[PDB]
Structure formats: C-alpha cells, structure tokens
C-alpha cells in the first residue's frame, strides 16, 4: 500500500490552521515540518509497547484490579446445550487494553497482521523469498534498536484481591479455585443485539409493517425487560474500547421468575366479583386466548404439532388456577363474606383456610372435602365457554380429541383438592 | 440419576435481602444456580460432618421476587438502584462500581444420603440444618430468620426411599402443597440442542440460538407470535477454562495457597420456571454440579429431569 | 511474617430493611395491624436562588431569571391525618466468630491473627464494644431525621430463640443521649447478650421496634434512592424514595451505619460525637477523613503494627480495630500487581 | 449554516424550566456558550433542540454528559 | 475564616399538607366529621383570547380559529350546594436549633457561624421573628385565593401536649390585617410559644384550623399539579380530599420581610435569597446593593461586619427556612 | 393474501351500525378504500375486524385515530 501515510497532510493545515500568531513559536511552527512529520515516533516510543490485545479482561469487575488480562480463547465443551465464547474464532473482536493513547498505534498495528490477501495460487508467486530490498547489515547498526521490543510484553500470571475468586468442588475430592474474567468479545458480539434486532432499519421496517398489517418475509424480534450495566465511571476509556459504539454500558438479558412484578395484595373473592370467578385476574386476556390458539385452527390439516399445544396450553390454565388458589390461600387473614356475593358459592374447599373454626354450611365440610365438581366441572365449562364461534368441529372425529385433555384434567384434579382438609 | 437421595429436606421459606441480581455478564434477574449449589456445600461443611450426613442436591423454588430497579423516562430498559459508598481519604467521592440487588423469598429442597439418617431422628437433622442456615448468606444476601404475627414455618423431612407406592404419591404430593405459590427452576439442556438442529435454515451456533428463545418475537402474517414452549430463561450454566491449571502457590493473589487455580469464563444455557405439579418426583428437581477437571468444564444442572 | 495479599472480613451485626407503619400512640402495644406509610408524588415550583457568579451584576439579568421558575416532581411520605406515631421495625442478627477472616492467603498471618484476636478477647470482653453497639439501639439513632424534633421515642427490643420472646426490653430513647455513652442497668443485660452473641458461634436474633410520636400528617423521611442514569425525556421525578412492597423503608446499610457510630477514640472532636467506624475514618457529611496515614491511627497501620511486629496500640485503638473487624471489609496490600 | 438550540439552566437534571434560544453552528459551540451565560453555581445546564429533545447536560463542574 | 463549600440547613417550621373539608358555619364546634371537598372534572369549551403575533391579524385565519375551538377537561373543586364554609386543617411543627447546619465542610467556619448565631440569640431572642410568624398564623394567609372575597375567616390554633390541648387560641383573620404587624394580648402568647419552640426550650406542635364563609357551591382553590379533550388543569388531592401543598402553606408563613432596599409601598414579601416574588417578576434584594442574603451572611460571619439590627432578622429568617448555601 | 375488514359509516364514534365487508391487503388499503365508499359529510368511518374489534376511525376531516 502507498497512500497510507500520505493522507495525513491535507487534514491538518487546511482546517485547523487559520491564523498563526507570533505569540507562539514553539511546537507547531518550526518543528512540525522538521521532526514531527515522519520520524516522530522517536520521542513517542513509550506508548507503543504499553498495550495488550485481549479477549477476557479484569477491569470491568473492578477498575482498581491489576491482575492478568488474558487473550486465550476457550475450547468447546462437548456437551449439548452450552453457549460460550468458544463458538467465535473469526467473528470475534479482539479488545485492546492500555492507556488513553490507543487510537492511532492500534489501527497502525492491526492492518498488517490481520487481513492478508492470499487465496488464489498455491504454486505461482508463493516460492518467493528474494523480493526484499536487499540492503547491507553493517550500515544500520546503532539506531535500529526497536525490532525486538515492539511485541514482547510481560507475563507473570496474576490475580487481584478484588477479582472474584471462587471454589468449585471436584467429584469425591478437594477443590479448584476458579477466577472468572469478564468476556469482552462475547459481550461485544451480543452487542449486535442492536443493528439486526432492536432499532436497525430492517427491523423497524417490519415494525412499521406490523402496524399496517402488511407482509414481507422478514419478521422482527422484540426484547423486553433488558437492563443497563454501565462500566467505567464518567470515563469509559480507562477500562476498554468502550468508546466507538458501546458507550461504556452493557445490555443484560432477563432471567426473571413468573413471580416478577406480581401485584402486592391479591383481591379477595366474593366482594364485587362479576367478571372474576374462575379466571382469576391475569394480564393475558388479549394474549393467551385472543391471538394464540385461534389462528390456523379452522384449516387444520395435520395433527402432529397442533394438538400438543392445545393440550398443554390448557394445562397451563389448570396450573395457574391452582396458583391463584395458593395466593388467595395465604396472605388473607380475614373474611367478611356477607355482602356483595350473589352468584359465587360452594368455594369453602377452594378459597378458604381452616381458620381453626367450624366454617361448615350444614354439612361435614370441616373434616371431609369430597365430590369437588363444584369447582372442577364448573371451570371445565368456563374453558369451553371461552369460545363459541367454533362450528365445524361437530360431527367430526377431531372433536373427540378436544374431550381427551378435558378427560385428563378431570383425572388429575380431584385428590389435590381433598388433601388440604384433615 | 447420580446419588439418589434417601431423604429430602425442606428448608421451608427463606427470606433474603440484597441478593446479587446481575448473575452473569449477559443475564440479570434471579441469581445463578451455582450460588445455591455452593450454599448447600457450605451447609455440608458446617453440619454435614457433625451429623455424618451428605447434603448434595438442592431444589430452587422462588416464591416472591423484587429487584431494586427503576425504569428511566423515555426508555423501555431498566437501570439498577445503587448505594452510596464511603469516601476516600482524599475527601472525594469514590468510583461508582454499580451492583444489582434483589429481595428474595425461596424454598430449598435438600437431599440427604448418608448413614446419619439411621442414627438420629428425622427431627434432629432438620433443626440442626435450619438453625445453621440462619447464620449464613445466600447470594451475597442475608438470610433473614423468622419473626412475624403468624407462626414460623417448620423444616420438614421425607424419607423418599421409605413407603409403598401409595406413600410415593402421598408424600410427594404433600410437599407440593408447600411449594405451590412459587415456581421451580429446572435445567433444560435438551431443548437448546434440539432447537439447534431445528434451525436448518441457517447454520448458527448455540449463542445466537439461545438468544432466539428469550424472545417474544413476532412473525409476519402469511401478525402472529411464534409459539411458547413454556417460561424459558437464560441461566449461567457453569464455567469453562481459558487457562491451564496452576500449581497452588504460583499466584500470590489467590484466596489461599493450597488450592489450584484456573482462569475461567462463563457458560450459558437454558432453564425453565415451572409449577411443581408438572413434577412427577421431587427428587428429579434437584441441582447438582459435576466437573470434568481433565477438561476445563465446571458446570451444574438438574440431571434425571426428563 | 507479612501482610497477606487477600484479607477480607464478613459483616457481623447485620440488620434488615426498616419498614414504616403509622398509627396512634397508646395503641402501640397492639401495633401489629397498623397500615404502612406509602410513598406518593407531588409537584413543587421554586425560584433558582443560588449564589451568583462574580461576573454578572445587573437587575435585568436577575429579574429575567425569576420570570421563569423551574418545576419538578418529587416523592413525599407523610403520616396519615389521624395517625401521630411512626412505627419503624427491623430485625438485627448478631453473628459472631468475629476475628476469623473470610479470606486470607498466609497461614502464618491467620495463625498470628486469630491469636491476637484471642488475646484481645481473653484479656477483655466484647463488653466495651457491646455497650456501644447496644447504646445505638437503645437510643433510636437509626431514626435519622425521624428522630429530630420528635416528642417521645420508645424502643422495644425482643430476643427471639425460635418463635418465642426470651427477654424483652423497653427504653426511653430520648432520655439517653447521642453524645455520652453511659452505663445503665437494663441496658447492660442487652450488652451482655450482644457480647455473648459476638463471642460464640451462631447467630443471636433481635427484633427492634421504635415508636416516634411526631404529629398528625407530618412528613416522615425514608431513605432516598441513588439512580445514576437519569431519564432524558422530561418525564422523571427528581427525588425517589425507597419502598419495600408499597411500604416506605430505610435501607439496611443506613441502619447499619447508624449502629456503627461508636468511634470516639481518635484524639480530636471535643464536641462532635461518635463517627462511624471506617478504614481511613471518613464522614460523608463532613466531607473529610479523620484518621489519616500521616498519623498512627489507620486500620491498615494499626492492624499490622498489632499483628506483624506485635506493637500493640493503646486499648482505645484496639477497640477501634476490633470494631472495624466486626463491620467487615475487603483489604489488599497486593503481593503481585 | 447556524442551527438553533435551547439553553436551559435548571436546578437538577429532571427539572423543567423555560430556556433561552441561541444561534450556534455546532454542538461544541453550544457547549462553549452554555459554559458561559450561566448565572448561578449549583445548577445544571441542558442543551435541547427547538422541539424538546435533549442533547447534552452538565451538572455543577463535571463533564458534558451527552444524550444518545 | 472562609465560607465552606458545603453548607446545608434544615427547615424549621414544618407544615403538613392542608386538607379541605366543607360544612355549614355555626356547625363549627362540631366540625370533626365534615365531608371532604372532592376534586372532580368538567368540560370546557374555550375561546381565542390571547394576543396574536401580528402575522395572525388576518380575518381568514381568525374566523377559522374561532369557528372550531378547543375543548378541555379541567379539575375543579367546589363546595357542596348546601355547605357555605371551607374548613382547612394542618399541623405545624416548630423545631429549634436554628443556627446549626446539618452538613458542613469546615470546622472554623461552623464554629464561627454558631458563635454568630448565638450572639444574635443572646442579644435579642426569637421574639421578633416569632411575632411575625404568629401573625401569619393569626390572619389566614395560608388560605391564598380561598381568603379573598370571604365573608368571614376564623382561625383556631391548638397547642398539643401529648394528644391533649394545652392552650387553644381563636382569631378573626379579617380584622387582623394582612399588611401590618400589630400587638395583642392573646397573639403575644402564640408568639412566645413559637419563640420557646424556635429557641429550643419546649416541644411545640400546633394544630391550625381555618374556616372561611365562601358561599354555597362556590369554587375553592386547592393547590395545582404540573401536567405530565386533553386535560388543562390538575388539582392536588391526598386520598380523595382536595388539599394544599405543604410548601405553599409554608410560603405563606415566612412572608414576614418588611425591610427592603427598595420601596416599602408593597407590603411583606416572603423570605428568600435575593428577595423575590414571581407574581411581580422582580427581585427586591439585588446584589448590586448590599442587602441580599449571601452578602450579608458573608459580612456578618467572616469579616465580623454586622448588618443593621433589622437585617439580622432577615438573615436568621433565611437560616430558619433552610437551604443549600455555601460556595 | 387478502384480509377481510368491516367498514362502517356511523354518525359519531360510539354508534353501532351494520357495516359492509371489504377485501383488503393492508390496513392502509382499507383506509384508502374507506376514504371513499363514504356517502355523507358529517359522519365517522370505522374499520373493524370480522369479529367486532375496532382498528381505526376517522371523524369528519381529521387523522385516522388508530385503536391500540
């Protein structure tokens, strides 16, 4: 290449040099065309050995940590469902660690080693070793002292007292002390959550086409509940290359329970209940029942993957009904059930604790709790009256399949409602 | 099904304040399972030798969760609430090294193996485990012992090798009454592998494909949303070596000069929160950690969960 | 025979978050059903009246600045209009096993560390530290601004074995001050309980309730939350209060800071009072740090004079070093860099 | 070209106050002339567009925190 | 010797929110069970009333803008149709320890500031300031627009021992002027109770109740919120009662400043640094002259140049309201 | 694909009237062919699904107010 050090002279004295006053005659007026032009790295040979090219580093754990930053890429596990940094190798971006003088010398050192252009020939112009300059070795003895020290950084594998060390028990034996590092390259690769997914152009095009109900074969993705982990302080350059497009921050994926953002104190039954009888209160009114199981239900032609989710999506409702029962089981230390209820009855086995008191209704309710079709069939019909526009299932052998899983949730629901009253 | 427990032990309702909520460089939320598998091993080296028993498995049941987060004005993401640290000796403010915190209400199904079951009563073991576990910290967070208006929740114990087949659905459906307001976190390693050869359209790795199960991603109208296999989350699933193993003195900043060291990375996987009524046997719900120290794999999972 | 590169201690005297309730005084023996104090928002308009610079002295440039007020939304927590009493309860656990590190490199340093901790303990108890930790519970210093200008403060401390109340205490928190640590009779039993909890192995659980009679509808002061990313829309509040499930609350680290203010042993402060125990002993309100490395008063210097070269300090400095072990802390000296 | 900005001097970051319109070429010119034209000490400068989008702010002797 | 870069004073005279209720006059001695005033909505069609900016002088746009107007929803608070009296009730807490900062950054500046404030208190007490605060409790200036055009305003102040009433006071707020400070044998007692509260002798909690005959169904004016048929006006309400912000009640208490470097033909203003009123849009204590708060504080504390005896009351009154001072 | 909509022309927003079924590809196509097929002046157009869920409406020379 030839234009690589030649594109530096037109950007300096054209825009920034607007007036040169005689009050200053020290560095930019006399020395810039003398020593600062080509042989300028003589006095700048103290930031060039300062850097290090890493993949896993230590300073995001704590900025005052002075152990080892390592480059060594991992091996593959060999076990199925495990995701790490081992699946990179040509898509990885190698982090640089040093001072605040790592913008120019890094781009200068990067291009010559990574990015060579040898693909075409295996025989022709591959056996060449005499296409060098071929100069003498005695003429340049004294002042060429920088050939060997340009690469060799120090070793000395160390950790730090603020570096997050941990013990891991071996099988039938002692321990290994594990010191995890922060993966810069993997967090950088996952910071391509931005352009292809969140607010790049092809994603927001399909977000526009979602509102207009259009159709092209790019569906988009939506990432809820991400968190921001900001590294550095006000200075995300004393840590890493956190300055180009990852502005000293880290996007975190959620790992939350369903108990996440649960409502504080549940509403007790039989005070103003007109809609909420066996549904519970759930936020998936427009989510689980409206759009989920109601598309490609009228033109079902295969029965391999269709009725499995129709079998388990109602098992989810049968589970979350018991979840609602368990939430209203605790957390409610009082009952005043005399007003407000005119269609909600026979629930003393379902939403009532023992209370150390005979809450009987002229029956043997307090020590015996059988025939629980006052709940089981009573929401097994609630599930059927969640939809009434389905018409052509009648007179078909597939309507028997709908009564299979409701013969199943009328199998597994009885004895888990008798065993609480004893 | 390595080392089947002869006895399950239910630490009933542990209330935890200020647990670590970051849990990995990529995830956040409920803390790592390795915290729980280290907590059961810290129980094991305080009461496990004095009672000649073996605490080895652990079942994670989260009843209540709350994080110190806040949503900023005009963003759909979250940021973490912080603490004001002390100053320096210069008199200036120190750096803000941010940390996530969470409150936490958990239940722990432990699993007991040894010969100390047959010497002590089942009520001796449970007190010595429970009142020990109120002296310790779970995920960097304080385990808060009971005081309230109600009654303290007691530490039970089953003997799940004992009893007939009627007792094998009388006992394992009695504890599930005490685990039901919350959800259990299990390891789903077969889903993330069978979703990897499911992608025949592209030829990806597991990294971009675990990122394609966390999504409520929206498919174009041939709109609709791609199907839900359950409540799936990303979990840290162990560690993997990025260094050879070092002799136990040749780093002078280790935690101790008697144990070997490796520099490791994380290792991400898939898990599912599920109600414990889907669980056939509650011993299948337990978390173990196996290591391959000839490789660099130090990981944890729930085995025997089909 | 040298300082270990890793040395860390774990937090003994571990409190919880302090929830806030509200009811009436003299119904406070039956205060288990009082509703929580909730955090709500309000609006506030004010003029920018701060110190001007030197350069602009002009009536026109000042009067045009107060043509435009600024507005902001803040959080506020008040008692209800019929409640005059604030109830603040938290649970303390006193762990014990104090001088044992949770991390140490050198076996020699741990061996001549726990021996020096034992010859502190065997020569004199934790009773001097225990009276000063219990005194900060008996006066309600954990009520920070909720204490000032209160008419009556009443503290109730219950030792709890499993679910029972072994011994209960009862104090007038205003009757004992905040400056001078005095000796009492009902308070030394609590001091002996805290000392026997620190010395043994196994936790001692306390519940501490404070009742502050403040007035109907007055403002209470929960802890304020630190958010480093402020929302760039104009939507966001300017002041967020901490709340544990729709109940206004004080952080656990602020309660614990209030319990640690026992440090009266640095040769200064003829009228300041106790400060908190910290290495390089520093106060965030005062801004400065009172224990400096230029003088023989720092934990990093007192500790290794007392352990490595067995140059014991004064006894009042040994109390500081042991109190600084009870709070915890991560320490270095960094044998490799 | 000379672009229009709104320079605001508020108490803290999340405060609303009617600001003064400037004429500046770059955002760095707006930060220079918002370094001056500040009357008080413990206040926060904020630079906005004409329609209310934030660009940068500075809180009592710190860096200009840019608003992405 | 120099001013500390961190100073912070707390506010003394803590007021609460003031809750508004309604009933009938001559049912005032049984006004504990009065119904609260509720904030409700109504629609508003408006008209083009503002100045046009001289490019909208044309009839072709003014007719089009008056043809299709804008419709708004406002929050309004009225009395009921049979209730004529507005009851307003808040509690006041008078703390004391007035000169001590809560955050400071010097030990010599703090010691000399406490020396200076102790010199002030030991020369004359808090009696002159407390007279002017008791006067703003006696007249019902905390009723802001709820006081103008009122047929009668009566203020009752109870002093609270434990929950019991030690002393009760009773004032006609319209006879006691809004633009003077006179003396009365029953207002001297309230002034010296507030003086014994601010000097630190006793614990003082007050219960202030004001009644105002506004008229049947007339509009009462709660404090107003900032907006986050689009709604034009939002009123402050604590649970469902209409209420007044605590800082607007607190503002109407420290309107005691009658010492200006400008003309005294405008009444008392509120104690502020650079003594300012937004409703008149100008600051009456300019730092061109030497009578704002910061210059007087620096001269009285640092270089021991005391101001006049009347300006010392102003400087101490700025220390009572608190604030973030210091360079 | 061609989706089915219900175009309604009502007096005001909260009026019920039996509408006419169209065949349209997108919702913007339905808004274009509901801009026409309107007979009267002071009326409100409304676009619905086949089961009665509202999608958008337009009230006598204004924007289409979308129904989230």
Curated annotation (Swiss-Prot), chain A:
Ranges where the record places region Disordered: 64-85
User: According to the entry, what is the taxonomic lineage of the organism?
Assistant: Bacteria, Pseudomonadati, Pseudomonadota, Gammaproteobacteria, Pseudomonadales
Record keywords:
Antiviral defense
Specify whether tRNA-binding is a keyword of the entry.
no
Which domain of life does this protein belong to? Bacteria
Q: Name one GO biological process term.
A: defense response to virus
Q: Can you name this protein?
A: CRISPR-associated protein Csy1
The record makes one more remark, namely: In this bacteria, Y.pestis-subtype CRISPRs do not confer resistance to phage DMS3 or MP22, but instead are required for DMS3 infection-dependent inhibition of biofilm formation and possibly motility.
For this UniProt entry, which residues form the secretion signal? none
Q: Which InterPro entries match?
A: CRISPR-assoc_prot_Csy1
Q: Which family does it belong to?
A: Belongs to the CRISPR-associated Csy1 family.
> Main role?
CRISPR (clustered regularly interspaced short palindromic repeat) is an adaptive immune system that provides protection against mobile genetic elements (viruses, transposable elements and conjugative plasmids). CRISPR clusters contain sequences complementary to antecedent mobile elements and target invading nucleic acids. CRISPR clusters are transcribed and processed into CRISPR RNA (crRNA). Cas3 and Cascade participate in CRISPR interference, the third stage of CRISPR immunity (Potential). Involved in crRNA production or stability.
Q: What happens when the gene is disrupted?
A: Mutants lose phage DMS3 infection-dependent inhibition of biofilm formation while there is normal biofilm formation in the absence of phage infection. Decreased production of crRNA in the presence or absence of phage. Disruption of the entire Y.pestis-subtype CRISPR region disrupts crRNA production but does not alter phage resistance (possibly OLNs PA14_33350 to PA14_33310, and the flanking CRISPR loci), indicating this CRISPR is not involved in phage resistance.
Q: What is a single Pfam family found in this protein's UniProt entry?
A: Cas_Csy1
Q: What species is this protein from?
A: Pseudomonas aeruginosa (strain UCBPP-PA14)
Instruction: Provide the assembly information.
Output: Interacts directly with Csy2; part of the Csy ribonucleoprotein complex with a probable stoichiometry of Csy1(1),Csy2(1),Csy3(6),Cas6/Csy4(1)-crRNA(1). A Csy3(6),Cas6/Csy4(1)-crRNA(1) subcomplex is also formed.
